[PDB]
């Protein structure tokens, strides 16, 4: 029901619901985008497509892979304007950890502080609650790689295989059938399922120049964006 101003601002409705935040859950879905993260091994893989509709539009200034710190990278879904302002806080408060505390921030600690900023916009009124979504990767020593995910509601969790954007319900259903026989994830088993999930949910079987791949691995812990040549190397490697 529409009681008082529950359909307009962040107050409680009857039956304990509140609508101005669960309207932001499908504020992501106007992007026309889907992002997939897979953790299987001593590595971690982001994969996300680009959508270039214009030849006048550039190629290097389209990338949704964002480098927070040298060991932490992220991908953004949802609307573009709220996405880049969310990253400005993530770049800022990752450096305040290094200044105040003297060492590198864990990927688990950073996803708390980002979701706590999205808390107050739900708590306080007249403050628009940032309709975008963030997925993190990184390497923790003595803990392996991790994949986290933040919500506009302020809810976070960590989990192994991630979908976002428009097509979560079709991709997460594919990955539970994928991750039930926990086979040997060997840094190319991870990349192949990262492609073949998105290549069957969208069902495109696409050219080598429409996606990005972010990677981090226990050997070279720096965040690393793949080259169009070596993206093509993994793409023809699954042509069987």
């Amino acid at each position: 029901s529409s009681a008082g101003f529950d359909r307009h601002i962040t107050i409680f409705s009857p039956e304990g619901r509140l609508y101005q935040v669960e309207y932001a859950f499908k504020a992501i879905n106007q992007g026309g985008l889907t992002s997939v993260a897979v953790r299987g091994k001593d590595c971690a893989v982001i994969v996300t497509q680009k959508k270039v509709p214009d030849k006048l539009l550039d190629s290097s200034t389209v990338t949704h892979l964002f480098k927070i710190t040298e060991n932490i990278g992220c991908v953004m879904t949802g609307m573009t304007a709220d996405s880049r302002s969310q990253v400005q806080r993530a770049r800022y408060e990752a450096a305040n950890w290094k200044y105040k505390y003297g060492y590198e921030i864990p990927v688990d600690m950073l996803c708390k502080r980002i979701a706590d900023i999205s808390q107050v916009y739900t708590q306080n009124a007249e403050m628009r609650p940032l309709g975008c979504c963030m997925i993190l990767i990184g390497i923790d020593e003595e803990q392996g790689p991790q994949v986290y995910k933040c919500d506009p509601a302020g809810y976070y969790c960590g989990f192994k295989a991630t979908a976002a954007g428009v097509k979560q319900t079709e991709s997460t259903s594919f990955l539970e059938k994928k991750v039930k026989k926990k086979f040997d994830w060997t840094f190319e088993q991870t990349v192949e399922t990262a492609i073949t999930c998105l290549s069957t949910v969208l069902s495109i079987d696409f050219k080598p120049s429409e996606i990005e791949v972010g990677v981090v691995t226990v050997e070279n812990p720096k965040f690393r964006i793949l080259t169009e040549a070596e993206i093509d190397a993994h793409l023809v490697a699954l042509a069987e």
Binding site: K100, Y101, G102, Y103, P106, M109, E141, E142
Partner: protein, 220 residues
């Protein structure tokens, strides 16, 4: 006041003494100068006594706030950064001379902190008034990667050199041994100084003092 620290092959041994004076009069014969920070980090205090006490309790409260929010063991470099950033803000008005030591995942770490905010990572340090005497024992007899009882013998030797210098102690040499798993804390480790016996009769009589007015108030 004489405090000292050392890093042996597995951990850190700290040492201190048990005298606080006011002017040139011994106020306390048993004072604790080794302060708790975390279950792996301890800190020895020197300088103004109330300045070191109120500083070492605040930062120990923040690390308990930090590690319980984080969910893992603290780092010695975190307590290093909190102390030198606080003491720089007061421009050296708070007189605190600290020896910071603990064992992290990365291993043992020993620091020395001056009241203006300058920090030094060193394998062995001395602070306090008798720090000149204790340092001469180190440089004569320090060697890298000592054993357990070899390092404990060096610190109790170095503290005792400051005790037989002026502003020494009523003599209860303290030790705090920090290792990778085992934690020790020894208040009466060495008592070299004893008080002599009283050879006189001082029989206080039951009624040898005149009383003007008495008053009785029961309780429950």
């Amino acid at each position: 006041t004489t405090i000292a620290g050392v890093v042996y092959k597995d951990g850190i041994v700290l040492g201190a003494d048990t005298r606080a004076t006011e002017g040139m009069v011994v106020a306390d014969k048993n004072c604790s100068k080794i302060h708790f920070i975390s279950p792996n980090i301890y800190c020895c205090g020197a300088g103004t006594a109330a300045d070191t006490d109120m500083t070492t309790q605040l930062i120990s409260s923040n690390l308990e706030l930090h590690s319980l929010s984080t969910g893992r063991l603290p780092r010695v470099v975190t307590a290093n950064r909190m102390l030198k950033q606080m003491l720089f803000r007061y421009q050296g008005y708070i007189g605190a001379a600290l020896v910071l030591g603990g064992v992290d995942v990365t291993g043992p770490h020993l620091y020395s902190i001056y009241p203006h905010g300058s920090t030094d990572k060193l394998p062995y340090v001395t602070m306090g008034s008798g720090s000149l005497a204790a340092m001469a024992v180190f440089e004569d007899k320090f060697r890298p990667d000592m054993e357990e009882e070899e390092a404990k013998n060096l610190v109790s030797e170095a503290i005792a050199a400051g005790i037989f210098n002026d502003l020494g102690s009523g003599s209860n040499i303290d030790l705090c041994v920090i290792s990778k798993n085992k934690l020790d804390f020894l208040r009466p480790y060495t008592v070299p100084n004893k008080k002599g016996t009283r050879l006189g009769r001082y029989r206080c009589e039951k009624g040898t003092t005149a009383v003007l007015t008495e008053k009785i108030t029961p309780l429950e």
